[PDB]
Amino acid sequence: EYGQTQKMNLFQSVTSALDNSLAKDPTAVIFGEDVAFGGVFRCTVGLRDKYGKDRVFNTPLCEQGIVGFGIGIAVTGATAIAEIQFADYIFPAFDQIVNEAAKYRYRSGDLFNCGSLTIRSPWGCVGHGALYHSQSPEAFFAHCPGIKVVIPRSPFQAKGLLLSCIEDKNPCIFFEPKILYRAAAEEVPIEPYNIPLSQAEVIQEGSDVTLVAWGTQVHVIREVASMAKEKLGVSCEVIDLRTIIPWDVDTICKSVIKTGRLLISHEAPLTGGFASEISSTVQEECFLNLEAPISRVCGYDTPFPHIFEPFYIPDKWKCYDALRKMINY
Amino acid sequence: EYGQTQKMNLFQSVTSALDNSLAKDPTAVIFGEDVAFGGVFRCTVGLRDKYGKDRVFNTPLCEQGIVGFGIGIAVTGATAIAEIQFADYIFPAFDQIVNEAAKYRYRSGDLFNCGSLTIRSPWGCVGHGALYHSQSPEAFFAHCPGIKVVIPRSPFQAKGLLLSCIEDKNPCIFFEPKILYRAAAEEVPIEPYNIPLSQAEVIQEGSDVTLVAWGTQVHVIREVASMAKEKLGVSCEVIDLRTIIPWDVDTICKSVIKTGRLLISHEAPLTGGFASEISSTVQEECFLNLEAPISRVCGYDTPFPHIFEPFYIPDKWKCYDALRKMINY
Amino acid sequence: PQFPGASAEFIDKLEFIQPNVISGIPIYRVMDRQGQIINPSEDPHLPKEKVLKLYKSMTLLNTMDRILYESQRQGRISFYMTNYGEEGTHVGSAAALDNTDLVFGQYREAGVLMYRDYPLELFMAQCYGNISDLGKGRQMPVHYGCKERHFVTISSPLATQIPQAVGAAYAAKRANANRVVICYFGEGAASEGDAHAGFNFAATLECPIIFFCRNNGYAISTPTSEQYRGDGIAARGPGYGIMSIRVDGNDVFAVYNATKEARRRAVAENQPFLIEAMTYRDHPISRLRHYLLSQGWWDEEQEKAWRKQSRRKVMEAFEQAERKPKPNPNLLFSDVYQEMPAQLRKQQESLARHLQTYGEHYPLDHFDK
Amino acid sequence: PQFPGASAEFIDKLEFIQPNVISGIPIYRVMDRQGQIINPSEDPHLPKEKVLKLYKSMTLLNTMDRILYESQRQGRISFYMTNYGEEGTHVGSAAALDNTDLVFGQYREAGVLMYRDYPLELFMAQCYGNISDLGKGRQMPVHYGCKERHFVTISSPLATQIPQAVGAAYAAKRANANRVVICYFGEGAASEGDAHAGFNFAATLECPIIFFCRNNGYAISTPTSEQYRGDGIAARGPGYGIMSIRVDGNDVFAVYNATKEARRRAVAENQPFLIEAMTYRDHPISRLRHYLLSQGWWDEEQEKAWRKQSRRKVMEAFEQAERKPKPNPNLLFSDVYQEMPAQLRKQQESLARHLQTYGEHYPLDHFDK
Numbered sequence A, B: 001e002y003g004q005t006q007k008m009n010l011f012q013s014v015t016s017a018l019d020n021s022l023a024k025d026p027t028a029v030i031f032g033e034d035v036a037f038g039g040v041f042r043c044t045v046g047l048r049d050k051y052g053k054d055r056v057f058n059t060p061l062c063e064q065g066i067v068g069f070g071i072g073i074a075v076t077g078a079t080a081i082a083e084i085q086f087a088d089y090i091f092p093a094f095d096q097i098v099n100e101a102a103k104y105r106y107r108s109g110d111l112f113n114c115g116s117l118t119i120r121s122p123w124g125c126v127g128h129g130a131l132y133h134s135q136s137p138e139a140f141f142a143h144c145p146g147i148k149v150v151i152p153r154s155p156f157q158a159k160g161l162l163l164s165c166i167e168d169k170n171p172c173i174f175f176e177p178k179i180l181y182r183a184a185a186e187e188v189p190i191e192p193y194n195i196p197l198s199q200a201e202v203i204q205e206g207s208d209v210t211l212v213a214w215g216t217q218v219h220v221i222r223e224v225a226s227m228a229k230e231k232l233g234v235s236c237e238v239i240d241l242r243t244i245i246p247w248d249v250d251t252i253c254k255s256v257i258k259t260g261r262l263l264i265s266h267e268a269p270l271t272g273g274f275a276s277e278i279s280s281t282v283q284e285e286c287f288l289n290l291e292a293p294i295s296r297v298c299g300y301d302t303p304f305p306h307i308f309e310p311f312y313i314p315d316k317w318k319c320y321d322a323l324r325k326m327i328n329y
Numbered sequence C, D: 001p002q003f004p005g006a007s008a009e010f011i012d013k014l015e016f017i018q019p020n021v022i023s024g025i026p027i028y029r030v031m032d033r034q035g036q037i038i039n040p041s042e043d044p045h046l047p048k049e050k051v052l053k054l055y056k057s058m059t060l061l062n063t064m065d066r067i068l069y070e071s072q073r074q075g076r077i078s079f080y081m082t083n084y085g086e087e088g089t090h091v092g093s094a095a096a097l098d099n100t101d102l103v104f105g106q107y108r109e110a111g112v113l114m115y116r117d118y119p120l121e122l123f124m125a126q127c128y129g130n131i132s133d134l135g136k137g138r139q140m141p142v143h144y145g146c147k148e149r150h151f152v153t154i155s156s157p158l159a160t161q162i163p164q165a166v167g168a169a170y171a172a173k174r175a176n177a178n179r180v181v182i183c184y185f186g187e188g189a190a191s192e193g194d195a196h197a198g199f200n201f202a203a204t205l206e207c208p209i210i211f212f213c214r215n216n217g218y219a220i221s222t223p224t225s226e227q228y229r230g231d232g233i234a235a236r237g238p239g240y241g242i243m244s245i246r247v248d249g250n251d252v253f254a255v256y257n258a259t260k261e262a263r264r265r266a267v268a269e270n271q272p273f274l275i276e277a278m279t280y281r282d283h284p285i286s287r288l289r290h291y292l293l294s295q296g297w298w299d300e301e302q303e304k305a306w307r308k309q310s311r312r313k314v315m316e317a318f319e320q321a322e323r324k325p326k327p328n329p330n331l332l333f334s335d336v337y338q339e340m341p342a343q344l345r346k347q348q349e350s351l352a353r354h355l356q357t358y359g360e361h362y363p364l365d366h367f368d369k
């Protein structure tokens, strides 16, 4: 398919995407807290020595300023790849993201834009990260017309989705599931390649029920597909949404039209989580095919706890039990 | 019912609530940009002369600092009523609101809290406010466990809901529909009174369809109820949600269980708007009663335009046409 | 002392460092209230034609303000922010810039556009949101932008342009084409956290940018006693390692000299400069007038003739603006993203259908196609 | 000059104001590296018992750090932030405070809790998230809080406590019971916009608060050359109208004198003070040791005995912490709001049912009830 490959874990596939970007786009710079020495998750290792201290550099410890600065770079046409050290700390930049980056092109009649901006950030739980090293903020951004939000599930998906976000002409947030940074490696092409934005991927076909998730939770619903087939002889269609907005409404409705049943799952809290947007849309377009209520299996409506994490997350057992009931509705 | 009343418009009913609070709670202070001289919508007129310059005062022009400062007051047990001048400018405080105020009690095991905090802010469209004088940010806050979000529809509802937010022991955002500040007046009691939080109100009973909205859009769906009865002989049940979170799931399901059909409406953009949360929940609890898809009639997924406002808002005609189709589904 | 955070000696006596507020950074002035040059060695000796261009831009801006302000009071436009007291800061600083220097600002920077020859008809088109607005009628009045004149579209949220401006200056440094960025804001906006972000990034990243703070003593109702307690904003520059100066914003020559010299050094040295121009919420126009008179470059007759011609240029542009249609409602949906997502096209399509059936209820008469 | 924003004279010469960085605010020192008092007129002559309490709190904190740090390396706890180099700033400043002064901080302030006698078993309970944690096991390790000791629960997002601390100081002013607030943060956290918000509000609202900035030259990997370009953080105080001083954070006596005097004036005058304590990423403990020796207040034998006793107190608390159960999972749902919303109870109930059926798959063995 894509030429010579190499075993990479997710952090490695990130550095590969960033290295390929800097190599072919002379305007591109990478900046944020502690990126110069390689970053706290090693995602920028070797890149400042390779490309120069004016292209891969540390900013002061100020998130609103990191995003505002990145927008200013992108206004001149240069590629700005900003990092926010944990997705949990993206909120001081919420006004720059939502009132500024997202609206820049619209409000100017396309006289100005920040489409060459990408903000990449570690995301999702990690076993022990508690309130502020665990968050999945995607739904906060989903209500904001003008940004793209993208979340991969593996090293190969990560490099190709990050390359698309970097090259896309709209401000993008790329959320990197941090618990996968050093998990299992898979083969990833050395040279650049793209995976399309706003396109979900059906990774397993099935006929009885549709499962949708993103990031690490995709591996959760893959295991639930196995459990269900094994324990209930139920055929699950398993879908990785990938892009949160704009999202692939088409691929998800087509599937629900075939199976008649949907379970959506994410680590973020239930209330106002993105599963409600997919749920309500699917219900509107597929109403006459629904055999049972669309289920949402999500984190509880609480902050993300340290010691109680094992009981908080929407794990395979929570999902399997929800699927079971849905089958018997 | 509530003693001597007086004709008040919404701005007046706000000052009445704030005056009653300061009169009976010696700890209470009101602060924000330009509140000392009465505020840019006249909501604090006369209150600094009456109660003192240490109790009703101007801060520097810094929203993150306004909310952080308010949280610090409330940590000592004192009532802090902060104002953000337009809801559109609440976003610089998003991190204080979401990572701090909302989580303060949880993360400390209830050793500390900011429950004596209320943030009040002008909200919703105004005819000509364009991108940054028009926004309805409620759905951004709805995904945050630990805050309450409340939105009244009239002067009488406003004073009683604001009094509850002020007195409730959880951090509250009260959004004041600014286009009503000087609209029609209604009788409002002079002395304090409370309207409960997390309780929707059925303002008109009906049998064929349920309509839900909040703020100014409640008057929109009241007119749609009239149109429908007149033009289609359709009996609408009209519901003002009032509290965005925690919301009155019970009152809304009871109604949909009776009517079998639901249309939800809000000025905020469709995607990730709060109507998707009500829609998906109602579908889960009332699935076997749904005669037709739950409809969402919302603003488009764009920023809020100056000159195109008449074509953007989910007005009575948009809603009526959606209801029509839903009746004939 | 061996501490990496600071270069300093020890002291063996406890002494707290006190702000000098009562006797602050002095105010640089070139010409007095009578238009007299105070110290000939500071005179910029701008040539007559340029100085007249300054005068005429200041006064034409003032004529347009008068007309549009009255238009707001009558409700023909929904919003207006004037430039009264700000004509000198803006025309005098713009004149010291290269034409291709990128400008960021907010509500009092129309003077910069005027000096750069932005057509009156376009200031008008934006205020009326008509078909001629390249902003497509999407933003509130006075939210001007011009890509040709290197003037970044204004947004309402205060101070957001400040760290953006620093980014554009960083990017300019890298591109190596000798350009500066200027960023204007008021003393109230300087209290937002984005000002502290911008100031700090500009110094640590070594960016060729001029921060131009206009201090008029008020942010809406809030006097400065309630906005800060240091010696204004200039006193804050040295704390970020930024070279700073304070100038008389009623003196176009003083604004010009400080801006010119800031630009020269910012560009050469890749370092930020802070100019705080003091103004009133004696007036830049009359002060320059007294200067024109003393050089023999202007007189009563010329002044009356120019007042009449500028009034008519403004009213020609005004009447034409008021009469143009607004853009097609289709344009509420474009430029949200660069491309239009299919689900957004689907909403465009739903409005089209809606207006097919219910259009009599919408003001379709005023909008194009 | 008649400008409301600033009190100042005119100047008739263009002169940009330059930062003095090479020769910065000097560093206040009381005792040299040998524990010798340098200038007797600055000696606080703290009584022996208090000074020994300082020494013992610093060293016991260091013993606990050693043990918990190794515990993190072995994976028995998930996170740890030590106090090495910070013992002097924290014990010396806490000692200058009243016991009821409210403390806000972040990751290097356990010294304050130690001086205020927070039980070792509670530092431990929080790190292990066990039943004895009044924080109910909800936050990452080292996120200490104590309502009894007036120590506001730490949160991970940097600088957020700074404007909160200013609010609590405003509220204290109004209550009129002679209390100060102290707010600790690092030089990296001082770059966030919330620091500029806090500093400014403290001066304009006239709040009795001490800002205590610990400057160790680094924020994770980022040296200060990349964090700011002014003369550290102290140089920024005067720009907000805040009285500022810089001290040797290796000298408990110097930290104590500046803190004591800041507290006295903040409370009396309702004004903020800024202390920047310089530290290393020569050591506060050994320096105080040399002082104890020269007064005849300590010796080798006492030092070995105390090292042994403190090690055993720490290990007693450690072993007990490790052996306690974690709290009931029911506690993940409470305190979200003060009351528990019905829809949240419904989720609590769904977990209970879930664990009825699938509990064998959860670590239920370690959690209470």
Ligand SMILES: Cc1ncc(C[n+]2csc(CCOP(=O)(O)OP(=O)(O)O)c2C)c(N)n1
Pocket: B033, B061, B063, B085, B089, C108, C156, C157, C158, C185, C186, C187, C188, C189, C190, C216, C218, C219, C220
């Ligand atoms: C983030 C934000 N908060 C508040 C406002 C409301 N506002 C519009 S102008 C203004 C005063 C700004 O004052 P200053 O920056 O001094 O400019 P000046 O009007 O004196 O020229 C305010 C508070 C805003 N536009 N943006």
Ligand SMILES: Cc1ncc(C[n+]2csc(CCOP(=O)(O)OP(=O)(O)O)c2C)c(N)n1
Pocket: A033, A061, A063, A085, A089, D108, D156, D157, D158, D185, D186, D187, D188, D189, D190, D216, D218, D219, D220
């Ligand atoms: C808002 C936010 N951004 C980033 C981080 C990650 N972070 C944790 S400690 C730290 C360095 C803080 O440095 P400084 O304030 O100097 O304290 P020090 O560690 O030197 O004591 C960083 C960047 C954070 N916790 N919060």
Ligand SMILES: [Cl-]
Pocket: C156
């Ligand atoms: Cl505004």
Ligand SMILES: [Cl-]
Pocket: D156
């Ligand atoms: Cl952290």
Ligand SMILES: [K+]
Pocket: A115, A116, A117, A118, A165, A166, A167, A168, A169, A170, A171, A172
């Ligand atoms: K991009």
Ligand SMILES: [K+]
Pocket: B115, B116, B117, B118, B165, B166, B167, B168, B169, B170, B171, B172
């Ligand atoms: K409250």
Ligand SMILES: [K+]
Pocket: C105, C106, C154, C155, C156, C157, C158, C159, C160, C161
């Ligand atoms: K702006």
Ligand SMILES: [K+]
Pocket: D105, D106, D154, D155, D156, D157, D158, D159, D160, D161
């Ligand atoms: K904090």
Ligand SMILES: [Mn+2]
Pocket: C186, C187, C188, C214, C215, C216, C217, C218, C219, C220
């Ligand atoms: Mn001002």
Ligand SMILES: [Mn+2]
Pocket: D186, D187, D188, D214, D215, D216, D217, D218, D219, D220
């Ligand atoms: Mn540090």
